[PDB]
A = this chain, B = another copy of it.
Amino acid sequence: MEKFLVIAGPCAIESEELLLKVGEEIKRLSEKFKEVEFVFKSSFDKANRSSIHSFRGHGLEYGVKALRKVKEEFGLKITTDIHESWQAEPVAEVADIIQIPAFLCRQTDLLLAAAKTGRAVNVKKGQFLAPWDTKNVVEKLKFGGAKEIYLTERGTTFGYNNLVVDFRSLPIMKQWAKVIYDATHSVQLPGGGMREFIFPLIRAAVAVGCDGVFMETHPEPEKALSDASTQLPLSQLEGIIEAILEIREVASKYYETI
């Protein structure tokens, strides 16, 4: 079985300190769960918040420098998201995996900018996109030179201010890329979020079969500057990870062949 990916970290780079605190914990779990490839995630810019008054971040320069500290202090791989083509090059200096936001999954130039860096690229599936329509997204990355591609399931528009997770997307997308399940954005209520469903839905994802999971986690979610109602309390991370590795193991012999 392939090394399972767990992408995790605070939603936003609130400070270099917050980063070091989560990083410390992620490093501890990586030493325990040696069958997992851990990737530390945090955004240097929440460029698509609903409100002009909401927290965005401290800028690209500061964020890359704080992620670089996490990588240097803990030896952890790094992923962060870009919003315009010009950011691909500077971010690629620290990011092992460049993330493409869900609203931007069809922006050709942004995808090509990420792909020519030589870094892996993970595209969040747009809330508007059918799972079979990710085939062209992967084709655009492969055309642009990307050799390691991920597609992340994060819910689909289901009426107003609600997302539903159609688990059929996991085996469908697996036909053309590795698949990541985003356990924290899939339960958000666009323009909101329900923490009580994070755990059940992530159990469903590993029972269906995916190649990794993505989770935002913060020492104190209620105090977070972004995604306060969906970020997972840091102390709860180890137990969630153990549970998914257990459920994955027992379901794995039944995963179907693409």
Contacts and interface: CB of A to CB of B under 8 A. Distances in A.
Contacts of A86: 84, 86
Interface in A162-180: 162, 164-168, 170-171
Copies of this chain, count: 4
Contacts of A69: none
Contact of A203 (B161, B162, B166, B208): B208
A143 interface: yes
A56 B106 CA distance: 13
A243 B206 CA distance: 14
Contact of A256 (B85, B162, B199, B208): B199
Interface in A147-190: 156-162, 164-168, 170-171, 187, 190
B256 A200 contact: yes
Contacts of A194: 168
Contacts of A50: 106, 133, 136
Contacts of A51: 136, 139-140
Contacts of A130: 160-161, 190-191
A201 to B, nearest CB: 6
Contacts of A126: 103, 128
Interface stretch (A1-9, A26-34, A247-255): A247-255
Contacts of A56: 108
A104 interface: yes
Contacts of A200: 167-168, 170-171, 208-209, 256
Interface in A76-92: 83-86
A36 interface: no
A206 B203 CA distance: 9
Interface in A195-249: 196-197, 199-201, 203-209, 243, 246-247, 249
A171 B194 CA distance: 12
Contact of A83 (B48, B107, B203, B243): B107
Given A52-B136, A85-B84, A207-B207, A167 B108 contact: no
Given A47-B107, A52-B140, A130-B191, 13 more contacts: A47-B109, A50-B106, A50-B136, A51-B136, A52-B108, A127-B128, A130-B160, A159-B159, A199-B256, A200-B256, A203-B204, A203-B207, A203-B251
